[PDB]
């Protein structure tokens, strides 16, 4: 188990998102860290065909704010636009 | 909140990686907070529906196999 997010970091984030009286099985979260790492392959895939087409040696935040428009995320990119300017600032 | 190395880790298995700017980690690790904040809460619909108040494997499946933009998961996760 390292190909992977450490399994209590992605639950407490999954906690956060339900009723303080939700449990969550074990198996629910062993899937969704997966699903996370299935994530970062999927729209690093994307982001790296951009920055490869455009000539360029290093994946950047725009890159993968490409990718996850793309992939049909535009629901998160707003968001992240806003908190790579700062980031950048 | 997620561990910046271990994204640029599972970023790095990627065909034509290359080099990774330090902000594309830090801007993952928000990423991936909104899209385990929206598949869990996805996925509560399903427990939910089921009379349940424990989020099962079977309820993170049927929100995948119901929601357009977690169709890549649909086979890591089949019902």
């Given at each position: 188990q390292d190909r992977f997010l450490p399994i209590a970091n992605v639950s407490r984030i999954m906690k956060?998102?339900?009723?303080?009286n939700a449990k969550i099985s074990k198996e629910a979260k062993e899937t969704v860290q997966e699903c996370v790492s299935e994530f970062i392959s999927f729209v690093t895939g994307e982001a790296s065909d951009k920055c490869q087409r455009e000539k360029r040696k290093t994946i950047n935040g725009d890159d993968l704010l490409w990718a996850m428009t793309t992939l049909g995320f535009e629901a998160y990119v707003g968001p992240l636009k806003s908190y790579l300017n700062r980031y950048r600032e | 909140q997620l561990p910046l190395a271990r994204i640029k880790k599972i970023m790095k298995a990627?065909?034509?990686?290359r080099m990774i700017s330090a902000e594309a980690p830090v801007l993952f690790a928000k990423a991936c907070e909104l899209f385990i904040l929206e598949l869990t809460i996805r996925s509560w619909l399903h427990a939910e529906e089921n009379k349940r108040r424990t989020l099962q494997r079977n309820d993170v499946a049927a929100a995948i196999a119901r929601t357009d933009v977690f169709d890549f998961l649909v086979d890591i996760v089949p019902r």
């Amino acid at each position: 188990q390292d190909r992977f997010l450490p399994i209590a970091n992605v639950s407490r984030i999954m906690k956060r998102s339900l009723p303080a009286n939700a449990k969550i099985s074990k198996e629910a979260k062993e899937t969704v860290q997966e699903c996370v790492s299935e994530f970062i392959s999927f729209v690093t895939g994307e982001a790296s065909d951009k920055c490869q087409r455009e000539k360029r040696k290093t994946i950047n935040g725009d890159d993968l704010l490409w990718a996850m428009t793309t992939l049909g995320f535009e629901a998160y990119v707003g968001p992240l636009k806003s908190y790579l300017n700062r980031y950048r600032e | 909140q997620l561990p910046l190395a271990r994204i640029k880790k599972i970023m790095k298995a990627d065909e034509d990686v290359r080099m990774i700017s330090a902000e594309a980690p830090v801007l993952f690790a928000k990423a991936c907070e909104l899209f385990i904040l929206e598949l869990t809460i996805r996925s509560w619909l399903h427990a939910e529906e089921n009379k349940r108040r424990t989020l099962q494997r079977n309820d993170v499946a049927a929100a995948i196999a119901r929601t357009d933009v977690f169709d890549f998961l649909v086979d890591i996760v089949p019902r």
